[PDB]
Design a protein around this ligand. Structure first.
Ligand SMILES: [Ca+2]
Ligand SMILES: [Ca+2]
Ligand SMILES: [Ca+2]
Ligand SMILES: [Ca+2]
Lengths: 586, 586
């Protein structure tokens, strides 16, 4: 409430003369458009829309272009009475007012970046209300729509829909851990059948909440594209397929590196499990894995980054897509292959090739029980520490080294990080996987996410408020690539959790491959397919109310543009038909 | 060219008084709407739109309702200058003018049905031109759009796209039958990879040809629905899921009957293959299969018909859908299970249980080679006879028993059958299957459809012209359920044609199940999946021109409805920014 929208910082990295040039040339553009760019020399500059007669103009100017691309799909209210209907929506148009051509933030200019600010009065409110309820409401959800954009709004709406459906397995796995032993064939059915229903609910659910927030985002921006065929009314999109061809050996190259290194670190802990500072030597492969694969994957980001900027790349969203998918092959290997080696080569066999060893440098049954505890329970607790508490003490301590209340405030706003939805969402999609792939080992697992996600929903909202910078409102119509990638994940969980039940069916080469390890895959996994065919088509028929209301609303709109703009036959019709009709008597 | 659109026949099945009532009560409705219902007592009646000032009204009245449901998606030309732009389109509106409520054809009235007529001048033209070309053109395709409706138009456009892509396997299988033996692992790859590309081309192709013909059909009619909740602005659609639940044991009941009977008939021919009028006894299981399963399946139509009319069933198209899918489970069993028993139980084993027999009533290698010849080549030739030649001699001979040139013509028009696209399309989707499932046996198969489909395209067009009645123009936006069912078919072909290569890998219990029959399924069939994931997403990115032009055209239309209807900050903007901007020196 201080008449300010964005800050725009600078460099101090060059000589004084073109910095004097490059400061006012970007100021003159904002002179041309926005106005009242007030600056206070750190340099940064405050930016606010100058006149309401311009502000009411451009919001209408957005809501026109938002309409006639087929997104708003209503009649836009005319330019006289255009209320902004939100706060972040008002702060959205300013960002498209600045960032557009005809002002590149991260490149080509001296600016680091552009950030909006928080509302510390209502943010200290928003915690303490729904820190009390069981799980929060739509009237609280829309507060995270009217602020924080709409891409963040899916993230809580994904999480809330993921929260109130974990109450069904965590109740059920509570029973089989109490009634049965582990590995009950009743449990793995209720595991896998649940995972189909959650996705196909959420695929139906995104159609509502994007309709309810008036968004089908199909037009964001172009950048850096270099336009190898110029037209002003563009590039052969086949050459994407020629260069997405090159995307394939990346995954094997990430497989051959990180698959080797983790298994190399997996090889050593079995060696010390057999060939016994000895206890200090136990920590060594955990030390070796904890220092290489954060670095070695950080190499592989730079490769995929160097891959992803090959193409012209006309959009803005698909870079966030294409970088996510190429990062996702790393996250799949480095967070599941620790379990798969214990499950698939360590306990069935490998006893066989335990005498292959490093001299130059007996099956433990609880390797599985211990390590799945280490991933699904304990790693969230230290993940609760490394995400939240570590940057908070870094925010407070490093504050202490280095009308004027804003410049105390705004400079400490510049200290923080930007928020990424995707980097916080990838810890959710991975932690979905331990439920999908290794719930039959120790079936108290969905409790451990249920207790997590009630806290993680409150913590990640707290993480956005004070421990990182204000995200500018980006709009979206789905959760990105994560929806398509999530169904692939539970597909694999149909294979493994089927096989994992049989190999531990009271015991265990020892068990038959011919009769039971492959039929129990082929029967089960092809039963996972057809139930997914059943429910995906079933919930499509039950249409939800908003997308019916949207389809009604485009019908009623086209009613307006209609209405606002706008040789012998001798029967003489009717009477002589009575005479020929009377000829039915014969 | 005789000023006539439809004929409407009658019953002569009741007493004379309500027939006098029921004739004029349906005449009075047409008196209210159409006019000039001229009748000639067989009784039937000719129907033509009376005044052009009504005809130009109702075509505009269609093109309004066709527009504001979001199908036409253009501006409708106003009611003054509405040219019908076709012939069948003019004859389409008349059918919706008659059939609608506020005149049931097959029920509730004395009428058998309603039929339009042919144009024997141009139909004798249309054959002799494209009986000459290699394969016909879009200017000839649109002639089958401007007549015969648009649902028939997909059928040739499906067939033509299926014709000019058979030239690639029939060239390739010509090589491996000449170069290799059968069962070459190179051939089964080029078989299966082709089957992915054809579907995902045609899934992309329907988006063009429906756009090019201005059709996204989502509003046809309601009928017979009984409306168990009445509202005038309806039924809990969940009770469909309660009654599509009951649709599941139908398929097993069709499986347990016809799977037994065909295998029972399959059991007997092996008995005579081992236990030797003896040659007249050979024909007996072929006689037993040729008389029971046409009758036994004809029972199962009546069951699925009695199933399909359980629900309220609000649409018109989905009955043609839901009857097709429930008939399709019969067609899958009764036309592939003859081969699968020879392939999967006869040659791998069963030598084992050949001494189980009917006393009370040695492996032949060429059972497979003979029977696949009997299905993919010879059955088309007798299928060429039973479809075309048998009703034609039934048309001419039974004509000879039982200004007045029309009543010679029109009465012989009433002799014929209605045309079904679906009943003629199901012989195509099945004969796709022999290519998909059993092409590695005798790889000259895709030649035998290539030679077929050049003839079958010409014959089925001839079948519609003279040997069955004129189909009224029905509109559609796809080929119905057959597209979704076709991808399921080639899915199964990934399983069988993989396994069929290994079991015949130069020889053959004998071959290992453990090491090679199940890994060669699991490796291959899950490689069929991901290539289908590759191409389906690849051809989506390469957008075709018409659906880009459609998206442009809805953009430019919404341009018209837009345009036709329509506190300390003290820098003083720009100048004093030069002084504070000069403070970069420090
Ligand atoms: Ca966390
Ligand atoms: Ca978190
Ligand atoms: Ca035929
Ligand atoms: Ca035919």
């Amino acid at each position: 409430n201080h008449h300010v929208d964005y800050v725009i910082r600078f460099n101090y990295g060059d000589i004084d003369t073109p910095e004097a040039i490059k400061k006012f040339e970007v100021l003159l553009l904002e002179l041309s458009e926005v106005g009242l760019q007030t600056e206070v020399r750190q340099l940064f500059v405050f930016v606010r829309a100058a006149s309401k007669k311009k502000l009411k103009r451009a919001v209408y100017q957005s809501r026109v272009r938002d309409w006639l691309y087929g997104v708003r799909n209503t009649e836009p209210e005319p330019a006289s009475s255009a209320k902004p209907q939100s706060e972040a929506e008002r702060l959205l148009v300013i960002y498209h007012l600045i960032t557009v051509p005809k002002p590149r933030h991260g490149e080509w200019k001296n600016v680091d970046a552009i950030f909006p600010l928080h509302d510390e009065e209502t943010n200290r409110q928003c915690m303490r209300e729904w820190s009390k309820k069981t799980f929060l409401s739509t009237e609280d959800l829309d507060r995270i729509r009217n602020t924080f954009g709409e891409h963040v709004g899916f993230y809580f709406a994904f999480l809330q829909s993921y929260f109130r459906f974990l109450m069904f397995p965590a109740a059920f796995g509570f029973s089989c851990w109490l009634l049965l032993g582990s590995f009950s064939i009743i449990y793995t059915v209720v595991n896998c059948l649940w995972c189909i229903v959650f996705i196909e609910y959420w695929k139906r659910q995104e159609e509502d909440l994007s309709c309810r927030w008036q968004t089908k985002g199909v037009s964001a921006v172009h950048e850096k594209r270099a336009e190898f065929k110029p037209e002003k009314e563009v590039f052969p999109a086949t050459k994407r397929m020629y260069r997405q061809l090159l995307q394939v050996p990346f995954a094997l190259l990430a497989a051959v590196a990180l698959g080797a290194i983790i298994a190399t670190c997996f090889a050593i802990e079995i060696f010390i499990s057999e060939v016994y500072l000895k206890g200090y030597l136990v920590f060594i492969p955990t030390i070796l894995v904890s220092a290489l694969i954060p670095t070695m994957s950080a190499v592989l980001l730079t490769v995929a980054t160097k891959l992803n900027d090959y193409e012209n790349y006309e959009t803005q969203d698909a870079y966030k897509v294409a970088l996510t998918q190429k990062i996702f092959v790393v996250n799949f290997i480095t967070s599941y292959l620790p379990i798969i080696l214990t499950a698939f080569v360590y306990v069935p066999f490998a006893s066989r090739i335990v005498p292959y060893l490093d001299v130059f440098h007996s099956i433990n049954p609880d390797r599985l029980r211990k390590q799945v505890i280490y991933f699904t329970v304990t790693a969230q607790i230290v993940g609760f520490a490394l995400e939240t508490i570590v940057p908070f003490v870094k925010q407070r301590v490093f504050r202490e080294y280095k009308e004027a209340r804003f410049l105390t405030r705004v400079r400490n706003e510049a200290e923080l990080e930007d928020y990424d939805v995707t980097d916080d969402l990838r810890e959710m999609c991975i932690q979905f996987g331990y439920l999908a792939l290794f719930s039959p080992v120790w079936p108290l697992v969905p409790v451990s996410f249920l207790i997590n996600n009630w806290v993680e929903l409150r913590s990640d909202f707290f993480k956005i408020c004070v421990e990182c910078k204000r995200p500018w409102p980006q709009r979206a119509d789905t959760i990105g690539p994560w929806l398509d990638s999530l169904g692939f994940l539970s597909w694999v969980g149909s294979i493994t959790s089927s096989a994992l039940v049989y190999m531990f069916s009271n015991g265990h080469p020892t068990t038959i491959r011919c009769w039971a390890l492959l039929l129990t895959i082929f029967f089960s996994e092809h039963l996972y397919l057809i139930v997914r065919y059943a429910v995906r088509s079933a919930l499509a028929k039950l249409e939800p109310p908003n997308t019916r209301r949207e389809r009604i609303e485009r019908f009623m709109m086209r009613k307006r543009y209609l209405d606002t703009v706008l040789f012998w036959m001798r029967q003489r019709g009717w009477k002589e038909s009575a005479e020929v009709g009377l000829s039915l008597i014969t």
